[PDB]
Amino acid sequence: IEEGKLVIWINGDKGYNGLAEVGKKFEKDTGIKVTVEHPDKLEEKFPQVAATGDGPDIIFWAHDRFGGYAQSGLLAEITPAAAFQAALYPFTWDAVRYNGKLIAYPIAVEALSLIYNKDLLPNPPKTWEEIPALDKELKAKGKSALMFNLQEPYFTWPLIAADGGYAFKYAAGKYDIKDVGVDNAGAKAGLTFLVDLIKNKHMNADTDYSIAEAAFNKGETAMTINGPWAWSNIDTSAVNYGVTVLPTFKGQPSKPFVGVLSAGINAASPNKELAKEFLENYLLTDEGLEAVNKDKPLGAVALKSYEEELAKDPRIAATMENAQKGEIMPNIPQMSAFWYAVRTAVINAASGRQTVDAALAAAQTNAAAAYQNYIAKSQASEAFTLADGLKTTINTNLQAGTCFAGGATAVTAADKVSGKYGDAEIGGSAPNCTITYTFKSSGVSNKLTSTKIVMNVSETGILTKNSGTDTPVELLPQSFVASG
Ligand SMILES: OC[C@H]1O[C@H](O[C@H]2[C@H](O)[C@@H](O)[C@@H](O[C@H]3[C@H](O)[C@@H](O)[C@@H](O)O[C@@H]3CO)O[C@@H]2CO)[C@H](O)[C@@H](O)[C@@H]1O
Ligand SMILES: [Ca+2]
Ligand SMILES: [Ca+2]
Numbered sequence: 001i002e003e004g005k006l007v008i009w010i011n012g013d014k015g016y017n018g019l020a021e022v023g024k025k026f027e028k029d030t031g032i033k034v035t036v037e038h039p040d041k042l043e044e045k046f047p048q049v050a051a052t053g054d055g056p057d058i059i060f061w062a063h064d065r066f067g068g069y070a071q072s073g074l075l076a077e078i079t080p081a082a083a084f085q086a087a088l089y090p091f092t093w094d095a096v097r098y099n100g101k102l103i104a105y106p107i108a109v110e111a112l113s114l115i116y117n118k119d120l121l122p123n124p125p126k127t128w129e130e131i132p133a134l135d136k137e138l139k140a141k142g143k144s145a146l147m148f149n150l151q152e153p154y155f156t157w158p159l160i161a162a163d164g165g166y167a168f169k170y171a172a173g174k175y176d177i178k179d180v181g182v183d184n185a186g187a188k189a190g191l192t193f194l195v196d197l198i199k200n201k202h203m204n205a206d207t208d209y210s211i212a213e214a215a216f217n218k219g220e221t222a223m224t225i226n227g228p229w230a231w232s233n234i235d236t237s238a239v240n241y242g243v244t245v246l247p248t249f250k251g252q253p254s255k256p257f258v259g260v261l262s263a264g265i266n267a268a269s270p271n272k273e274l275a276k277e278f279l280e281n282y283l284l285t286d287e288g289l290e291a292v293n294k295d296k297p298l299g300a301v302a303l304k305s306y307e308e309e310l311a312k313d314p315r316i317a318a319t320m321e322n323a324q325k326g327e328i329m330p331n332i333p334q335m336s337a338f339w340y341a342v343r344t345a346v347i348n349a350a351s352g353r354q355t356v357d358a359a360l361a362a363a364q365t366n367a368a369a370a371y372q373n374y375i376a377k378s379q380a381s382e383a384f385t386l387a388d389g390l391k392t393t394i395n396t397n398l399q400a401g402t403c404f405a406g407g408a409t410a411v412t413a414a415d416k417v418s419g420k421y422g423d424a425e426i427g428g429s430a431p432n433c434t435i436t437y438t439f440k441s442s443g444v445s446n447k448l449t450s451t452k453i454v455m456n457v458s459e460t461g462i463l464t465k466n467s468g469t470d471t472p473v474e475l476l477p478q479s480f481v482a483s484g
C-alpha cells in the first residue's frame with residue numbers, strides 16, 4: 001500500500017463511477033490521487049491481501065462482514081467527533097460497533113423489495129401462494145411471473161425466515177452461536193415452497209443475478225426481487241416499474257436481512273488520516289451521497305440531512321417497510337460461515353441432490369467447517385507480519401556480507417522472533433536469504449500444527465513461496481501461492 005494515494009474497493013453492483021467522481025473532487029482539492037476498483041469477490045480477497053500488507057486503503061461492503069475483519073486485526077478503529085456522529089442515525093452506528101469499538105463508517109441501509117412491471121401486472125400478489133397460478137396464466141402469454149437470483153442466499157432468505165428460520169438465536173445480550181435456526185419446520189416450509197416452484201417449472205434452478213435482471217428489464221418476467229442498487233438499470237429500460245412489500249408466506253411477512261453498507265479503513269494503510277478526511281468531509285455530505293446515489297441508488301442513507309429528501313420517494317418508503325418487517329444482520333465473525341452454509345443448502349435442495357430436510361440438517365456442520373477454515377486462515381497471517389519485521393533485519397545484516405546477525409556470522413544467532421502461533425527465523429546464504437515460520441505443534445488449528453512457511457526474499461524485498469513450504473496451500477494468500 002503506497003503512501004500519498006487512496007485505493008478504494010467497492011462491489012461491482014454499487015455506484016463506483018459516482019464514487020470515483022467524489023474522489024476526483026478530493027484529488028483536485030488535496031492533490032491526492034484516488035482510485036476506485038471493484039475486483040470480483042473482493043470481500044474474500046480483502047483478508048488475504050491485507051494479511052500481507054496490501055489491498056485497498058478503504059473497503060466498502062455490508063456490515064455483516066466487518067466483525068470477522070475486526071476480529072482478525074485487519075481494520076483501524078474509527079474515532080470521529082460526537083458532532084460528526086450526531087449527523088448520522090444512531091442505529092446505523094450500532095451496526096458498525098464490534099466489541100465496544102466503532103470499526104467502520106455507516107453509509108446506507110438497504111433491504112430487498114418486490115419489483116413488478118405495471119403493464120404486465122397492475123395489481124401484484126400479496127402472497128407467495130398465488131405466484132404459481134399466476135405463472136401458469138402468464139406462460140400462456142409467453143411470459144413468466146417471477147425471476148430472481150437463486151445462486152445467492154441473500155435473495156432466498158426472506159422466504160426461509162418468513163415462517164420461523166433464523167441465523168443465530170439472540171439470548172439476552174449475546175448471540176448463541178451453536179443455535180443455528182435453519183433446521184426447523186418453519187425454514188423447511190419456506191425452502192420446500194421454493195423447491196416446488198423449481199419442480200413445477202415456474203423457475204429454473206440455475207437462474208442467477210444477470211439472467212433475472214435481463215429478463216425483468218426486457219419485459220420477459222412480471223416480477224423480480226432486488227435492492228435499491230438495481231433501480232438505476234430499470235430506469236433506462238422500457239419497463240414501467242413499482243417497488244412494494246414482499247409477499248406474505250403462510251400469512252406472515254417475508255423477513256429480509258437488512259444490510260448497512262459500510263466503509264472501513266485497512267489496518268496496514270499508511271494513509272489513514274487521508275482516508276478519514278475523504279469519508280467524513282467528502283463522501284458523507286449531501287453532495288457526496290447525491291453523486292453516488294445518482295449512479296446506483298443506495299437505499300435509505302445514514303446521513304440525516306440527505307435522508308430528509310430521499311424519504312419522499314415511494315420506493316424508499318417500500319424499502320423501509322421491508323426493512324422493518326425483517327432484521328438487521330449480525331456482524332459477528334461467524335456470519336460468513338453461516339452464509340456459506342445456507343448457500344450450499346439452497347443449491348443442493350434446488351438442484352435435487354438432497355432433500356430439503358437433509359440439506360437443512362447439514363447446515364450447522366457445514367458452517368462449523370467454514371468457520372474452522374477462517375480461524376486457520378487468520379492464524380496463518382501472523383507469518384506475514386513477523387516476516388515483515390524480519391526482512392528489515394535481513395537488509396541491515398547484509399552490510400556485513402551475510403543474512404545473519406550483525407557481523408559476518410556463519411549461522412543464525414538471535415535473528416529469530418516468537419509469535420502467538422509459531423516462531424520465525426532467517427535462513428539461506430550469499431544474497432539468497434530466506435525466512436521460515438514454523439507453527440506450534442499444538443494451540444493452533446490442527447490444519448497448521450507443525451507446518452512451515454518458507455519464503456524467498458528478493459533484492460527489492462518481496463516475499464515469494466519457497467517449495468519447502470508445507471502449510472496447506474489453500475490456507476495461504478493466493479498471491480503468495482501464485483509466486484510458487
Ligand atoms: O453466499 C456466499 C457469500 O456469503 C456472504 O455474502 C453475503 C454478504 O456478506 C451479505 O452482505 C449479503 O450480500 C448482499 C449485499 O448485502 C448487497 O448489498 C448486494 O451486494 O447483494 C449481496 C448478495 O449477493 O448476502 C451475501 C449472501 O448472499 C459472504 O460475505 C461472501 O463472501 C460469500 O461469497
Ligand atoms: Ca401502460
Ligand atoms: Ca469465511
Ligand SMILES: [Ca+2]
Binds near residue numbers: 340341344366370
Ligand atoms: Ca460449504
